[PDB]
Amino acid sequence: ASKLPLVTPHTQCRLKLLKLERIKDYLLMEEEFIRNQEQMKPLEEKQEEERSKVDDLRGTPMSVGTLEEIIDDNHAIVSTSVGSEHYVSILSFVDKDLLEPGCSVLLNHKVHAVIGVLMDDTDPLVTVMKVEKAPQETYADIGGLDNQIQEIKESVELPLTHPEYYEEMGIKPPKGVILYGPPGTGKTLLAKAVANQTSATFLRVVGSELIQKYLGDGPKLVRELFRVAEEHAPSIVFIDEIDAIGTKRYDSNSGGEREIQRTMLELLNQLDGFDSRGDVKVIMATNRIETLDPALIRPGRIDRKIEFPLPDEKTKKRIFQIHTSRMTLADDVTLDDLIMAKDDLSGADIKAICTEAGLMALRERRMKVTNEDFKKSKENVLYKKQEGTPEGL
Amino acid sequence: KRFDSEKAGDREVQRTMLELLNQLDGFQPNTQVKVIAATNRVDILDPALLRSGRLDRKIEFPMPNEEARARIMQIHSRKMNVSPDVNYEELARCTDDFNGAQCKAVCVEAGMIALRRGATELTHEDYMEGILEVQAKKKANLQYYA
């Protein structure tokens, strides 16, 4: 509460013990003094009737205006509801830390002096963008990533959890992370897991949502997305499917390509530009990283680049177990037979296999899923391959 | 130019242009307010705006020739202390494909080069260095040309 800034070594040290012991001693003195003085005289009546004078000063029918500009000398230009603007005086009982252009102020009825400020709604974009606890699951579900989980933790979680490690070495944490891999490997899953396991305001936006239909709205959306990310203390901004907005940036293009490029430039500036970015961490996922902009994924912009490979032999078993955990199975399931094939199977493919097997068991009315059911579901899932056989091979 | 397109926004500027056309020439002739207009492009201007009753005298401003370049450099070097050695004819010959702005840049860059060197008066070498700076030519890391 506006307490002294220790600014001692800032690492556990005897100097930091001494500065802290001193604060405790002074606080003990103040507490004893206030307690004894309250016992001697309550002063509750004195504290009251000052509020009565304040209420007298601010009449009964307080009007709601809109602060427009502070002349910085306890004066302001405030706009009434009709639209008129008045040059009034900011009285002394109004908490001036709340005043900012556009705030909803309370104005005196006769003299229009600023006599208070009203709280404002809490959804610029926060309710739309924030994900709350990720409905999917905690870190338990993710299977076989391990090293990628460790990298993500070292990027986003560790700075908030143990910052002393960074402050000791004097290095600032890595700026951002980009998750790249073939479609269906777990980028969004890991992002959601860290979102639900973290203590910071987590925001998610899909790149297709930044392709607005009106000029300048994509840039405005990115500007406001990063605007309500410093307003919410520590935050993590996860721009899923960046490939939609970021691209090689070929100059010779016409149409909405120019607007997409301008949106990308605004995002670039937000990631690293003239101003300091405060305390905000950026995660990005992209099935296709080779088509991105070198300026967009340059080191100072995105430090860490995590690769998500297709599950090979045992990660596959782990996902199968995880997705069949809450599902009764007959004692004839050859999950090893299912996974043994080198079919480039993805985790999303495994999830679809499990869901379809359960669905067809339900269709047949059975009470347990069978190995033949799993095999037929897998065959149906792998039926969605397409392409040409001889071509390319 | 006016075109039949479904995109809005251009129609508002077209309406402003129509008002400007009427003001220039139309009902209620005007004989007390003249007009001067400058354009980098004339291929996009509407025919009704390039008419003979609205913009009668269309004056072309070509890129300067050698003599024009020499005169521009002299004009912008009037106020500076320039030595009596500078061959403005040589500078004009060496500054082909320049405009008046680029010649002004040549002169100011020569002055700044002199200031960097710590010289009271300019010189032909300073002018050539300024020409090189204004040309904005980049090197290809090798010069295998004979």
């Binding site: 307490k3 690492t11 556990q12 040290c13 930091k16 013990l17 405790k24 606080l27 309250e38 504290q47 000052e50 004078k53 000063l57 230009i77 603007e85 008045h86 040059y87 009034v88 005086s89 009285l91 002394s92 009982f93 109004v94 102020v105 208070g116 709280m119 070292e154 070495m169 004097g170 290095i171 890595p174 000029l215 300048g216 840039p219 405005k220 100059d251 120019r258 430039l265 605004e266 003239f274 300026a295 340059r298 080191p299 100072g300 680049k305 | 075109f3 397109s5 995109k7 926004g9 251009d10 996009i44 202390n81 405009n99 702005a101 680029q102 840049a105 002055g111 200031l115 204004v134 904005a136």
Partner: protein
């Protein structure tokens, strides 16, 4: 418990907990309950309970914002336009002198006779007033390694003419008023911009190109005009257009309208930079990655006189960058930054900073408190080599 962070860790934790508890007790004892009406703490209902709010509401009347339109005759007679209320022909108050009021400025007027009482600052877009820097970055030219000639040119464009004006008037030189910075990503353009902002003793206005793009027709031009008017207000003021390629695309109007609004914004910017009216003491930076896309009118001298090229550093510059970025790090006594600079082929200061941070994090991973030359080598292998495909 934990593995042991420090012999004093438990004492620090206990003292912090006691401080928090004592703060809670003091707050409870003194009251200070939050108010939904925006009331300051009772200890700062100060002169507000009375004794200055009373003496501010009694003598200080309420003035109403208006905009002067015309001044009639030598004798004071002013036409004003009270917003959304009315228009009047009004006289001055005895406090305000006639010279203070000009045509077009905002003036407060009393509610009884509507006479002017105080001039007011011009109305400015919030989105253009927030471009002003206010608080300047802490970077300096010493933090930019590998760029000597570039920084010299940038200074003599933006810094020296402001710092030592007489040096140029004496020799009759009109120094260049604009500079363009271009090069590969991560070379230091925005870093040099921050250095200029820090060093300058004048207005620094930061403009990002994407901001000038607006939904409604004729908005980017209005923002540019307001920005340049605010700049002219100041005695001398620097404007920095980062990512100017967003709105500086080459004019290519043909058939169906394409980027016509952005082209109009660009044309307004060009007109302000150089046109009929004389530009004030306004020096203009511009940083971009693709100078090719810029239009000839904008790249013409008189708007962008100097064109500084930023390139990948040499071995010496790389050594200097390594030293700069390892300055505030916990490193061993003797690390061959020359060896590291050689071991990293052509690479940017961003890459070098990433290498330093990754070395620090390898140390933190191995649970060490001192980054080693081996850590720096591993960082180079991770950044320069493994991510070489990017």
């Amino acid at each position: 418990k934990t593995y042991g962070q420090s012999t004093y860790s438990r004492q620090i934790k206990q003292v912090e907990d006691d401080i928090q508890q004592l703060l809670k007790k003091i707050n409870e004892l003194t009251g200070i309950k939050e108010s939904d009406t925006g009331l300051a703490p009772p200890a700062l209902w100060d002169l507000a309970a009375d004794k200055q709010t009373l003496q501010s509401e009694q003598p200080l009347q309420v003035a109403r914002c208006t905009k002067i339109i015309n001044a009639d005759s030598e004798d004071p007679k002013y036409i004003i336009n009270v917003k959304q209320f009315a228009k009047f022909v009004v006289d001055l108050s005895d406090q305000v002198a006639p010279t203070d009021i000009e045509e077009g400025m905002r003036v407060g007027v009393d509610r009884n006779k509507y006479q002017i009482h105080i001039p007011l600052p011009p109305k400015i877009d919030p989105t253009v007033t927030m471009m002003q820097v206010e608080e300047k970055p802490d970077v300096t030219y010493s933090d930019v390694g590998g760029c000597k000639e570039q920084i010299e040119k940038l200074r003599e464009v933006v810094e020296t003419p402001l710092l030592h004006p007489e040096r140029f008037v004496n020799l009759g030189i009109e120094p260049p008023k604009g500079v363009l910075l271009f090069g590969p990503p991560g070379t230091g353009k925005t870093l040099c911009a921050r250095a200029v902002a820090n060093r300058t003793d004048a207005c620094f206005i930061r403009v990002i190109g994407s901001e000038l793009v607006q939904k409604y027709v004729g908005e980017g031009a209005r923002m540019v005009r307001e920005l340049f008017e605010m700049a002219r207000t100041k005695k001398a003021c620097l404007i920095f257009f980062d990512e100017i390629d967003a709105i500086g695309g080459a004019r290519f109007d043909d058939g169906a309208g394409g980027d016509n609004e952005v082209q109009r914004t660009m044309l307004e910017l060009i007109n302000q930079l150089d046109g009929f009216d004389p530009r004030g003491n306004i020096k203009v930076l511009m940083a971009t990655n693709r100078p090719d896309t810029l239009d000839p009118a904008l790249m013409r001298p008189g708007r962008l006189d100097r064109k500084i090229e930023f390139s990948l550093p040499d071995l010496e510059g790389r050594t200097h960058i390594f030293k700069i970025h390892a300055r505030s790090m916990s490193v061993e006594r003797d690390i061959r930054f020359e060896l590291l600079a050689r071991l990293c082929p052509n690479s940017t200061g961003a890459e070098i900073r990433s290498v330093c941070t990754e070395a620090g994090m390898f140390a933190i991973r191995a649970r060490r408190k001192i980054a080693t030359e081996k850590d720096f080598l591993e960082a180079v292998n991770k950044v320069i080599k493994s991510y070489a495909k990017f």
